[PDB]
């Protein structure tokens, strides 16, 4: 019988851990580049990289806030290298995707109302944000098994390089705020920490490491090819919107609240102040193409086939209730189908307030989805719209927000709508895999316990670190050495504005590399 | 010293994983049975069964919604068989209990506002729900250690059989919905996927598997016995309500919001429309047994010992405020204690709406608990009641909902009230265990890290897969080969309607089987 | 090649677990002490201690609730000892910190609206709380690897001793509650349970155990020394507020709701009913020092540099709106900077209610931080304040709560403000560690996956149980055998009241002990 | 296993070219061997592999 009540406890190697902190050198196209140098004869290994960033005090007029997880969203590229070349690198989007299921790391990255609320400054000496520090946990392959997976420095010099994105990407601002001045005065101040182990008489053996490599297809192509595939552990596909032909303007953003219903509530709340207007006589200050109609005594307004129920309480006798009936409208020919945002409301009730001279809306019933809130403002006034398009007031136009969030997936902020209806992977000339439903994403989420998985073929099911991972292997003799991905996008109605958002296909392939310690640290591609 | 800075990496078995999808054969009281045939000599192993279901478009009038986790709630029975007989099978209730701590799984099964809101249709060709797909993760014993525990096929054919519940179980509807037509045109459309491993030169060894078996006691009996118990790893006990002598109709259901406070707010908001009435003179349209009392000027109405504070703002000059003082009442003798739902309110404030002719309630103080929310409507009008019992309007009665949720435990929807006061397990003639408080449920939740455990005796604490599980073993010489459970139910007040809900005792015993691979897969019960 | 599709199942030791419940002997400055004797020749080992407590019915008038996690907040000290002396013991604060990442355990220890809502009784016979039972999971070092790490009883008698905190610690009450009567008749009723193992032919070997050891520095000293350090696994530093120079009264507590926003909204809710008063003529019932100013028809009141926007709806024509402009004020010299709570508000909007003769508030704009919610009432009226101080009504003064919660950290209830600005740890005369930012807290939270970590130096990274833990070892020959800690407190403004809250420095040292089984259970100190 | 997949009517273009017809259908042709004088070539089942 095997003993389940006792173990012979082994004695480990004698070591001593230490928290180490280094400051960096900043250098300046004109992208920020920080270089850190780790040189110490007594540091045998390291892992658990942490980057700290000091955010400066922000003053002036306008509305200003930071994007969620700013610390992660700032990193464009990371590089650990030695005398023999690059040991490991990753793009910002692969790092964020790997850290998406670690909620404590996301909390330390910067997720609070003090940072992420859209604050207002009313005077040139107002303080919008107090100074604070954020901490980015750079999750690496070196963390899986604690001491077992640490990076061994075979007495060589290791240098770490962090490339930052430009500061316009991580800031959410409107047009009143003086961005060119904030951009002229902003500087990144980084610091790097890691755990070092001082080990007596270490005996190092070689190990394996995976380096992600991504390829971005051309605009609107339903294809993308990954070349030079010799040992891949997985393959993942998703789409990114490209907003370069726009001004990057969006109507609203909810800030710290991140539920889908929070996004929808923020959109409805921004429109309601322009939808129902209480005024003396026909309302003024809107473009002439707006057809605004007074509500009859029975309280029902019919817009073609749609019925809107409008009941406002405590309205003074010398005032009326008006309804904007074509707030946003899109069409391609003058008497065909119309996408009309005001037809998506069915009941609107509320109470007017005579103290503040505005209407406080109560319960709303609507069918608004995330896509309407995710349509960029410039698509409403494009040259292909045969109607005017935007009949909002100028005061409301001044509340629009520039958003250059770099890690948006799908065609909405939450990646909820699935626009890939069929996927086909080809290895050489033969069909490796095809699917009609998102069954490979269901499998990815079950296997990794994540809420935001992607379409992933996983080829490795072997326990980490203690075994050589299993791979799909090229057969150059038979021509199998490239992975072609081809999708068919879902069909949408040409009168919905989202048909004209441009899309890109992103393929990610994890290659397997061999780490060796013959005269310094070196890596070798496995073939 | 043991090295904690290096590992000799093992080369694993050479293999290739593959996603496979099958379509099934459908067969047809007249419950649907689907059977899928898996035949391929190169699929050596499988695990991670996922079942997909197509839900159709729903048209017509009435109120309609799906139960939460509809994909799981649809499965009545699953069987996996080969040429030698049944390998494994489970009831839908045991499957749901095994999957109740997997939040990712429950999310994929279909839990969202678009499926689970109670939607209203107004016109015969209105679309209530769009078509959508749900995914049911059939958790099996083969998933514990990934590749280690997978089901080995020894060149034999494998068959999977899924029996579905009738569609009345998964729909929450009112009386206006045309159920015989929906039930006549609804069909289940299933598809099965799994991960297959192609293994070169596989070396199979025998394993161990746990097969659940359930026994149902008679109505209202406090006993149950499992015969032929030779090697059990655990023993579970819980209660189910039996609504078969009723029409299964209830007053409210909260839908997507699933907190206890949400159940109470939904129930209170269903009652409030009938509780405080603003009328011109005594309100009409109510049964004669209603006791409607005008509220005095100081705002206090006394119902015997209870005081109700009623303050309503902006009431027009030609109107008064009335209070229904016996909305629901139940009693067994004409001068004993009375259960009265009107006495559970203490303060009622709100404001009147001139535009919509209704009250918008603002702040309520009450002591309503979950049991009032879980009392079926038909118990109020039972022949035991010496009072009329139900004094709601007919318009209120027409909005009631049919609910046939099959996996409800306890006597309330959340299994919160513990109605088992004492438990006694007998092995042969000796008292194995007995308890008063729910200390064994506390242990079950600590040991499995679940929020919804049951009273469970666990006999096995050895790490899974790598050891033969520990069991309680029969002593046939002494005659100890059956487990009889006896409970004592907690006493309730004879004037509470919940005392007359009928209960069933359910006992679940996990037996141990030996899997062997001498010419195909076979199981043998251990003696 | 290693087989990853099969394994040889080891037969474990033959055993039989059993749930065992014991009753205690209560004994009695006047702190309750419960002693339990475990003596039965057939129990070989135990773990998983659970303590149950019956809380009695509470009757009378006044406001009364329980602190969150009553069961854990009640325990002052735990000791397990045999005839040879103490085997293990821990203080209540270290136990709570060890179990703070276990949400299941916190849920069983008592966290619900039934217990934690602040209830009101109106007559001397009103029942405030129903009797209920709470469960305290006493997490031990014997739980890491289940059966592998369980405490073996080598035929000796084991005694468990629970020392209770006085009932004043776990109760939140106002002044109208009869505390001395409740305290005279309250009685702790404990019962202990554990899981025993009947083992045939057990084979016992010595193991390793860690005993936390606490040291508390003097009041307001920035230093603290830990003597007799020969093998420490970690070192922790934090601060506790000391309220001994006050009466322990606070303005608000949110009860069941535990978000930081909930703390703030409860504080604002208590202030707003006194901030804006609707009255016919100058409001009465305030101290002579109050400067109450009428709000002009324009709606803007200017208070020095601050501008307050006040808009109240539905105010009757014969009444006016007044604003309390110095509700709480603190200063140390007569014409310098002033901390004024009225200037922390910028916009106040709401609607008047003619039924309840009070204001229902709508949108509020404020800058209240958790420190304002965490200032004791005694500090506003201290002898160093050169102003009167508290111009609130006596009706508002009667709703303050006594709170003696024993495990508060930081200087606010949520441990959000970081008041330690620099930390230096000395080992002998050499600096072992120094830091400016909270990098050691970031590492503690990443490594333990908690949200309430402390500043911790960790020295052990080897897998538990199977390896002997790694320690920092004393060199008494060179004199390095003590751990000194020195902090510098962050500078605060001399006109903020929090500058005068007294602080204590807490150091926690985890000492390593060896457990041996040569004739009974014994421990030795590692040197 | 996927034997064949196509997005455009390339198998119908091939059918029409190979049989000189104006009204072909989507056809996988497995036999290209002269008629009658040879045993035609076929795609053959492998019941062992399903």
Numbering used by the authors:
A (entry chain D), B (entry chain F), C (entry chain E): 18 to 45, 49 to 547
D (entry chain B): 450 to 499
Which text from the study accompanies this structure?
Image processing of D13 trimers revealed a small subpopulation of adjacent trimers bound together, forming doublets of trimers. Although the resolution of the resulting 3D reconstruction (3.9 Å on average) was not fully isotropic, it allowed unambiguous positioning of an atomic model for identification of the intertrimer interfaces. There are two major interfaces that mediate doublet formation. The first is located between one of the head domains on each of the two trimers. Side chains of R353 in the EFH loop and D325 in the CDH loop extend toward each other, suggesting salt bridge interactions. Another interface is located at the base of the trimers, which would be proximal to the viral membrane in the IV. At this interface, the major difference of doublet structure in comparison to the singlet trimer is the unambiguous absence of the N-terminal tail α-helix. The clearly resolved features in the reconstructed electron potential map between Y62 and R498 suggests cation-π interactions as the main stabilizer at this interface. Furthermore, the doublet is characterized by a slight twist of the trimer axes defined by a torsion angle of 8.0°, leading to an arched arrangement when the doublets are linearly expanded. The absence of the N-terminal tail α-helix in the doublet structure suggests that its displacement likely helps to initiate intertrimer interactions, promoting ordered assembly of oligomers and leading to formation of spherical IV-like particles.
In Vaccinia virus (VACV), copies of the double-jelly-roll protein D13 bind to the viral membrane via interaction with its partner protein A17 and assemble into a scaffold surrounding the viral membrane. This process leads to the formation of a spherical immature virion (IV). The 62-kDa D13 protein exists as trimers both in vivo and in vitro, and structures of the recombinantly expressed D13 trimer have been determined by X-ray crystallography. D13 adopts a double-jelly-roll structure composed of 8 antiparallel β-strands.
